[PDB]
């Protein structure tokens, strides 16, 4: 019972700026105590929930000076000052005034970072897989800002051939890079056919430089 | 020093049933709340339920109420939450905390501690352990000043796997990206970027372990010999 509703759905701020986690609530959270149970979480990449606020408004021990809950009636409110990169996370907001304690939906925080580029590497499929009749050429494209980056492969001076996976990770939250593996993927025949293998990094737009290659046969 | 440690990765067939643990260590067991919660995808968090170790006593949300049920053992000071009947919507991460909440009248809160987490995955597909590659460079070098290296954990089921290098004694540098679920069927890899001091002379091992398939495998990656 009870719905919490949060917004943004997700929001980038750059490192220095402040920013506002919103969480209207579908009841009132004031208890005959007069006390109003409203929690707030965060869970940074790969950790379990954290608690940063209780009771609307006290920062727990080691929450920093920079953020401030509050709130009244049914809208909270959490305002962070002056972001830092280890902010990075899901803020969760917890109403604990009504038995089944409901959380909001969270909120992503991704820190705007100046620009960066990424370091190429490539590498050719393992003999061991080639003994079972595969071939997957991989790309790690590592230590970039923004995210979304435009990554090509060119085969035998051609397009790209028998298709390619890709996969990012969380932002670095110490630093504020990501990494990205891409993963081309051609049978043995296929390979064993062309010998030039590319791997060129657009930064966003234009003509793909940032480029890794090797020569099947002369290796 | 306060600890919670849970419960390893399940993997059950839908209808059955699994039992999983937190055992706590560092503060006195008896003396506080346990919650569990569980983190789906959609879903997306919900509180379960919560057990005070001392007096035994229990508290259900109603959603739960008949899949879940909570013990606790003095003794070892491990909690525990038994899932019933399991199906395609069990599948999420379940948590367990000492949250810290007093009562209404207290109004106290005590540092929140949290365990790792347990994986659970309900499906009836067959287990496939993954295939381990040593992907290592070449031609006129790679990598010029740091070196990368990586492994790929092609096709298995279902996740996770646990990559590390050198047995943890590789920490440093190393990346780890998700894996994506292709035909029924996930893959991953992960990459290590170490001086070329240690590259030529100097190990290293890319080690893997499936927990659901009980497999565990060692690629020293080799340099090219062609
Ligand atoms: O139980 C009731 O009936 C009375 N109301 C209360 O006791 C208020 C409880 C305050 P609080 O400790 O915030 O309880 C809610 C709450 C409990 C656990 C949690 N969690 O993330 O584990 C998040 C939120």
């Known amino acids: 019972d009870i719905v919490m509703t949060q917004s943004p759905l997700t929001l980038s701020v750059t490192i220095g700026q402040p920013a506002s986690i919103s969480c209207k609530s579908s009841?009132?959270?004031?208890?005959?105590?007069?006390?109003?149970?409203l929690n707030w979480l965060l869970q940074r990449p790969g950790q379990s929930p954290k608690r940063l606020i209780y009771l609307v408004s006290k920062l727990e021990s080691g929450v920093p000076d920079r953020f401030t809950g509050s709130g009244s009636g049914t809208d909270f409110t959490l305002k962070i000052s002056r972001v830092e990169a280890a902010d990075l996370g899901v803020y969760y907001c917890v109403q604990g005034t009504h038995f089944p304690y409901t959380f909001g939906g969270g909120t992503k925080l991704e820190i705007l970072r100046a620009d960066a580029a990424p370091t190429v590497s490539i590498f050719p499929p393992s003999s061991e897989q080639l003994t079972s009749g595969g071939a997957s050429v991989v790309c790690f494209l590592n230590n970039f800002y923004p995210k979304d980056i435009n990554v090509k492969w060119k085969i035998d001076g051609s397009e790209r051939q028998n298709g390619v996976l890709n996969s990012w990770t969380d932002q670095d939250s110490k630093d504020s890079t990501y990494s990205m593996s891409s993963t081309l993927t051609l049978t043995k025949d296929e390979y064993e056919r062309h010998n030039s293998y590319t791997c060129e990094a657009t930064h966003k737009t234009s003509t793909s430089p940032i480029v890794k290659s090797f020569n099947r046969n002369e290796c | 020093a306060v600890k919670l440690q849970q419960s390893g990765p399940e993997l059950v067939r839908p209808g059955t049933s699994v039992k999983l643990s937190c055992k706590t260590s560092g503060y006195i067991f008896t003396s506080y709340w346990i919650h569990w919660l569980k983190q789906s995808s959609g879903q997306g968090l919900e509180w379960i339920a919560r057990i005070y170790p001392g007096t035994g006593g229990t508290y259900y949300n109603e959603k739960f109420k008949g899949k879940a049920t909570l013990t606790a053992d003095k003794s070892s000071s491990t909690a525990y939450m038994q899932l019933s009947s399991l199906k395609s919507e069990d599948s999420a991460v379940y948590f367990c905390?000492?949250?810290?909440?007093?009562?209404?009248?207290?109004?106290?809160?005590?540092?929140?501690?949290w365990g790792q987490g347990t994986l659970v995955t309900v499906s009836s597909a067959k287990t496939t352990p993954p295939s381990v590659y040593p992907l290592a460079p070449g031609s006129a070098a790679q990598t010029n000043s740091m070196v990368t290296l990586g492994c790929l954990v092609k096709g298995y089921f279902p996740e996770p796997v646990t990559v590390t290098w050198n047995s943890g004694s590789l920490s440093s540098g190393v990346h780890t990206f998700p894996a994506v679920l292709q035909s029924d069927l996930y893959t991953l890899s992960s990459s290590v970027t170490v001086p070329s001091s240690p590259r030529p002379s100097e190990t290293v091992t890319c080690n893997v372990a499936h927990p659901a398939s009980s497999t565990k495998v060692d690629k020293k990656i080799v340099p090219r010999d062609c």
């Open positions: 009841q009132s959270l004031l208890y005959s105590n007069g006390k109003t149970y």
């Open positions: 905390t000492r949250w810290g909440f007093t009562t209404v009248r207290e109004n106290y809160y005590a540092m929140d501690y």
